Structure formats: C-alpha cells, structure tokens
Amino acid sequence: TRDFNGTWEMESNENFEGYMKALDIDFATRKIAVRLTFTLVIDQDGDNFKCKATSTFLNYDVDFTVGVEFDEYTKSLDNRHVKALVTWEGDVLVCVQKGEKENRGWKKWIEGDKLYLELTCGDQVCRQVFKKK
C-alpha cells in the first residue's frame, strides 16, 4: 500500500544517535534528542505530501510533491542546504537529499498497520517504527 496518511506514534527508534552524529549535530542537542519519542502527522493527496514530525525538543516539517525536485534548508537539524527529491520504488517512498553528505536521505514503507522510516547519512542508518494512532 502506498498510503501513509494519518497520525503515527513512535514505537521503536534504533541508532538515532549515529544518524544525528553523521549530521554533526552538537552534543547538548544530540543527547537531549536521542531520548525523545516522535509523533508523525502526514497528509498525503496523490503526489502532494506534508510532514510534520513532533517531539518536545526537536520538530521537523517538510512539504513536497513526489517526482518534483525541491530545495531544502534543514534549519531544524544541521542547518544545511540540500536538493531533495522524493520518488517511488515500488511501494517504498524514497528521498535523496543531494548535498555535502553522501547517502543522505530516507525511505519508507508500510508493513501491515505499521510505518517504517529509515534515515540515512554516510554509513549510518537509523530505523524508526510507528503505529497508526
């Protein structure tokens, strides 16, 4: 299924620390953020998507159209400019963020009532799992 709509509660978070250090996130910010649980609210209509990821310390919003390149400024994270592109590989939603860092992006999919989000940067991979609220 290609339908990520809804509110998603984090159930599992693996190696968020390695991801954030690959982004060179500062120390005080990093080890507050590795404690946190996230909630995702996603609105998907065709190619149009809107994320909103929330926590008590770090929040992240992105809006994009699948198959349209867009410039992203990751002000809430590492404060870098990247050229982002989100496309479909089968039923997996794939984002590439062309920038200074190699292999930066994320992937995603639904595995029967659960949402999986994989964040990558350099040789680091963080895996997050959410349940549909």
Ligand X SMILES: *C/C=C\c1cc2ccc(N(CC)CC)cc2oc1=O
Tell me whether residue 22 or residue 108 sits nearer to ligand X (CB atom): 108
Tell me whether residue 38 or residue 85 sits nearer to ligand X (CB atom): 38
CB of 122 to ligand X, least distance (A): 15
Instruction: Compute the distance between CA of residue 15 and CA of residue 47 in angstroms, rounded to an integer.
Output: 30
* Footprint of ligand X (CB under 6 A): 38, 40, 42, 51, 53, 60, 62, 77, 106, 108, 119
Reduced 3-state DSSP string for 84-120? EEEEEECCEEEEEEECCCCCCEEEEEECCCEEEEEEE
Tell me whether residue 53 or residue 96 sits nearer to ligand X (CB atom): 53
DSSP letter, residue 77 = T
CB of 43 to ligand X, least distance (A): 9
Cβ 4 vs Cβ 93: under 8 Å: yes
CB of 57 to ligand X, least distance (A): 11
